[PDB]
Write a protein that binds this ligand. Structure first.
Ligand SMILES: CCCCCCCCO[C@@H]1O[C@H](CO)[C@@H](O)[C@H](O)[C@H]1O
Ligand SMILES: CCCCCCCCO[C@@H]1O[C@H](CO)[C@@H](O)[C@H](O)[C@H]1O
Length: 504
C-alpha cells in the first residue's frame, strides 16, 4: 500500500486524478491524461497510483526522463519501492557488426555494478511486495528470463534471490546438446553457400560459449541463448519484465505520442541489428528470439494503460475510452502569447528581441530547419553582441544536457537548434521561443510539434512565441488556437481564485 508524501494536488490535478481513477475503476482498458506542460503530470500519476493500490510500470521515451521520473517518484513515495529498470544498452556498447566497415564490436564487459544491481533490485521487489513503482525507458522492455525459475530459486535471517535472470539450467547438459545441434545445421547452411568465413566464425564463437557454459553454468552474452533456457518455441514472444509483475499491474506511457511509436518500432529496429549478426555468422538464428516485443505482443501482456501527453498521438486518440484534461497549472502560469511575423527583416527583428530580453535577464530559444541555417544564424548572432550557442544534432544526451544546463544557469542567453524538443529545455528564464520557417512542411512544424515547442515559453510570466512566416499553415492555425484555448482557461481560473502569474 502506497504512502504519498508529496505536495497536495492543485490546479487541475484534483479533477484529473478523479477522472482517471473513475475510468480505471470502471474497467477502461485505455485512458489518456492530456496534460499541458507544467501542470504537474508526475503528481497526478502518483496520486492515481496511490488510489488504485496496484504495482505500476511507468515507461519514458529516453534514459534521462526515466531517471528523472524515478528520482521524483522516490521523493513522493519514500516508504515504498521505487525502482529504475535501467539497461546496459543505455550507457554501454552492445555486441554489433558493421558490414560497411567489416567491423565487429564487442559488448562492453565488467561494467558499473550499479546497472545490474538496479535491475535485480527491480525484480526482487516485484516478487516480494505490492507497493512497487518501476520506471524504465521503452528500450528496457526486452527478453528476460522465466520469472518462474527466478522465483522458485531462492535461499532462506534473509531470503536470497538469484544473482542472474537467466537461471533455468533444467538439464544444462540437454540444453547444450540442443544448441550444438542448431550450430551444425547453421554451419552447413554457410558451407553450402561457400561462406567458410562465416561458418568458421560461428563455430569458434559458439563452441567457446558451450565450453564456458559447461564449466561455468554461464558465459558472456548468455542472453543470446535465452530461448533454450526458457523453453520457448522459435518466433514466440520472450519473457520480459512484464512477466515479473502481478497480473493486475497498471502501465503509464509518459510522452505517449513519442513512446507509443517507439514501442511500435522496437521489434523491427532490433531485428535489423540482430539479423545482421546472424547473416555474417556471429550469432545463431535462435539469437533472434531474445528480442523486444511487437506492439501487439506488448498489448497482450498489459491490462490497463494510461497514456500521458500534452499532444496525444493517433493511437491514443483512436483507442482511449476516456480522455481527461489537466490544463490549469498549480503555479497559475499562462500559456504564452503567440505572434506571427513576416519573413522580411526576420533576422533583424529576432536579434532586437533577443538583446532586449538578454538585457533584463531573459533567455531565448530559436528553432530553424537546416544545419546551414543553424550554423550561420548562431555565428551572426554572436558577431552582433549576443551570447548564443548552437545545439548541434550530433551532441549526445550528456553534451546536450551540459549545454542546456549552461543556459539554465545563465552562462549564455540564446540557444539555436533544429530540434528543440529535447529534455531539460523548460527553464523559467526563457521568455521567447522563435520558430523560423514556421509554415514549412516537416515533422518539427507539425501541429503537435508546434504545440510542444510553444510550451517551452510557458514557465515565464511574459512568455511569447514568434512564428516567422508569410502564410498561416493549418498546423500553425491549430497550434495557435490550442495555445489560446489553454491561456484563456488559465486566465479564467486565476481570475476566479485571485492568482496573478509570477516567474520563479
Ligand atoms: C556439418 C558440415 C557439413 C559440411 C558439408 C558441406 C558440403 C558443401 O556443400 C556443397 O558446397 C559447394 C561449395 O559451396 C556447393 O557448390 C555445392 O552445391 C554444395 O552442395
Ligand atoms: C489538445 C491537444 C491536441 C494535439 C493535436 C491533436 C491533433 C489531432 O488531429 C485530429 O486527429 C483525429 C484522430 O486522430 C482526426 O480524425 C482529425 O481529423 C484530426 O484533425
Amino acid at each position: 500500500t502506497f504512502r504519498y508524501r508529496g505536495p497536495s494536488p492543485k490546479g487541475d490535478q484534483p479533477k484529473a486524478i478523479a477522472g482517471l481513477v473513475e475510468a480505471l475503476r470502471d474497467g477502461e482498458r485505455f485512458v489518456t491524461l492530456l496534460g499541458a506542460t507544467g501542470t504537474g503530470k508526475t503528481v497526478t500519476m502518483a496520486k492515481v497510483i496511490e488510489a488504485l493500490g496496484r504495482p505500476a510500470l511507468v515507461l519514458a521515451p529516453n534514459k534521462i526522463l526515466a531517471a528523472q521520473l524515478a528520482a521524483e517518484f522516490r521523493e513522493l513515495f519514500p516508504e515504498n519501492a521505487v525502482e529504475y529498470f535501467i539497461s546496459y544498452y543505455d550507457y554501454y556498447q552492445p555486441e554489433a557488426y558493421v558490414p560497411g566497415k567489416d567491423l565487429y564490436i564487442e559488448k562492453d564487459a565488467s561494467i558499473n555494478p550499479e546497472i545490474e544491481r538496479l535491475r535485480h533490485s527491480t525484480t526482487r521487489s516485484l516478487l516480494t511486495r505490492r507497493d512497487v513503482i518501476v520506471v524504465a525507458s521503452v528500450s528496457a522492455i526486452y527478453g528476460l528470463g522465466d520469472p518462474r525459475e527466478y522465483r522458485a530459486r531462492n535461499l532462506v535471517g534473509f531470503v536470497l534471490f538469484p544473482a542472474t535472470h537467466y537461471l533455468s539450467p533444467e538439464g544444462l547438459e540437454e540444453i547444450l546438446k540442443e544448441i550444438e545441434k542448431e550450430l551444425w545445421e547453421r554451419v552447413r547452411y554457410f558451407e553450402e553457400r561457400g561462406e567458410v568465413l562465416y561458418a568458421q566464425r560461428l563455430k569458434e564463437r559458439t563452441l567457446y560459449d558451450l565450453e564456458m557454459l559447461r564449466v561455468m553454468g554461464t558465459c558472456p552474452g548468455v542472453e543470446n541463448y535465452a530461448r533454450y533456457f526458457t523453453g520457448k518455441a522459435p518466433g514466440e514472444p520472450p519473457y520480459t519484465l512484464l512477466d515479473y509483475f502481478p497480473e493486475d499491474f497498471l502501465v503509464f506511457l509518459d510522452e505517449s505520442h513519442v513512446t507509443v511509436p517507439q514501442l511500435q518500432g522496437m521489434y523491427r529496429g532490433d531485428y535489423a541489428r540482430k539479423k545482421t549478426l546472424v547473416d555474417y555468422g556471429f550469432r545463431l538464428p535462435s539469437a533472434l528470439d531474445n528480442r523486444p516485443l511487437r506492439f501487439e505482443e506488448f498489448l497482450e501482456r498489459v491490462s490497463q494503460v494510461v497514456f500521458v501527453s500534452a499532444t496525444p498521438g493517433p493511437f491514443e486518440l483512436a483507442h482511449s475510452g476516456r480522455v481527461v484534461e489537466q490544463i490549469i497549472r498549480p503555479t497559475g502560469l499562462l500559456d504564452p502569447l503567440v505572434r506571427v511575423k513576416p519573413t522580411e527583416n526576420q533576422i533583424l527583428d529576432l536579434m532586437e528581441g533577443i538583446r532586449e530580453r538578454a538585457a533584463r535577464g531573459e533567455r531565448t530559444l530559436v528553432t530553424v530547419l537546416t544545419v546551414r541555417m543553424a550554423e550561420e544564424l548562431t555565428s551572426f548572432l554572436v558577431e552582433h553582441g549576443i551570447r548564443a550557442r548552437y545545439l548541434h544534432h550530433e551532441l549526445d544526451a550528456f553534451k546536450r544536457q551540459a549545454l542546456i544546463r549552461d543556459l539554465r544557469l545563465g552562462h549564455y542567453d540564446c540557444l539555436v537548434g533544429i530540434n528543440l524538443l529535447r529534455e531539460g529545455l523548460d527553464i523559467p528564464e526563457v521568455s521567447l521561443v522563435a520558430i523560423l520557417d514556421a509554415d514549412k512542411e516537416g515533422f518539427l512544424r507539425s501541429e503537435r510539434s508546434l504545440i510542444q515547442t510553444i510550451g517551452r515559453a510557458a514557465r515565464n510570466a511574459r512568455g511569447e512565441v514568434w512564428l516567422y512566416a508569410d502564410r498561416v499553415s493549418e498546423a500553425m492555425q491549430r497550434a495557435i488556437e490550442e495555445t489560446n484555448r489553454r491561456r484563456a482557461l488559465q486566465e479564467a481560473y486565476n481570475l476566479e481564485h485571485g492568482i496573478t502569474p509570477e516567474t520563479v
